[PDB]
């Protein structure tokens, strides 16, 4: 359940905060793959410390 939630936050971060066009944004299902293993901690960092 945790991966799905992070995948949504990343999507929101990419679209709302960094300005990625919604059309180019990968499906939530596809973003979940980025939170596999050590990549998860990395993207958490990105969502928190990296802003527009």
């Amino acid at each position: 359940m945790e991966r799905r939630s992070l995948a949504q936050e990343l999507k929101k971060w990419a679209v709302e905060e960094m300005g990625l066009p919604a059309q180019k944004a990968p499906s939530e299902e596809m973003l979940q793959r980025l939170f596999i293993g050590q990549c998860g901690d990395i993207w958490k960092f990105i969502i928190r410390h990296i802003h527009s």
């Binding site: 960094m18 050590q38 960092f45 928190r48 410390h49 990296i50």
Partner: protein, 100 residues
């Protein structure tokens, strides 16, 4: 340059704390996924050092938000900051009784 090496370089630029220990070859698999590749490429291009807000400034800003003080919008900030001469005008040390 393997997609993975680019990603790890970007992370180093973004001051990720464990970035020096990460080997690029370990992430080459992320770029093999034809569907995610465009996003990752985007990310590695879009994210620079100017986008990074240290944990200290974020905490300070949250504290400012919590302090009930109105957060000035970009337009307002531009107006007020214009009025700011870069020059170190030493904080008017309010004429410390000492100055008087």
């Amino acid at each position: 340059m393997s997609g993975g090496d680019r990603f790890v370089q970007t992370l180093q630029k973004l001051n990720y704390p464990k970035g020096a220990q990460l080997d690029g070859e370990d992430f080459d698999w992320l770029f093999e996924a034809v569907d995610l590749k465009p996003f990752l490429d985007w990310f590695c291009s879009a994210a620079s050092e100017q986008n990074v807000v240290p944990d200290e400034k974020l905490q300070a800003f949250n504290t400012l938000k919590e302090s009930g003080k109105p957060v000035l919008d970009e337009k307002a900030l531009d107006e007020v900051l214009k009025t700011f001469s870069i020059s170190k005008v030493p904080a008017i040390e309010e004429v410390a009784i000492e100055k008087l």
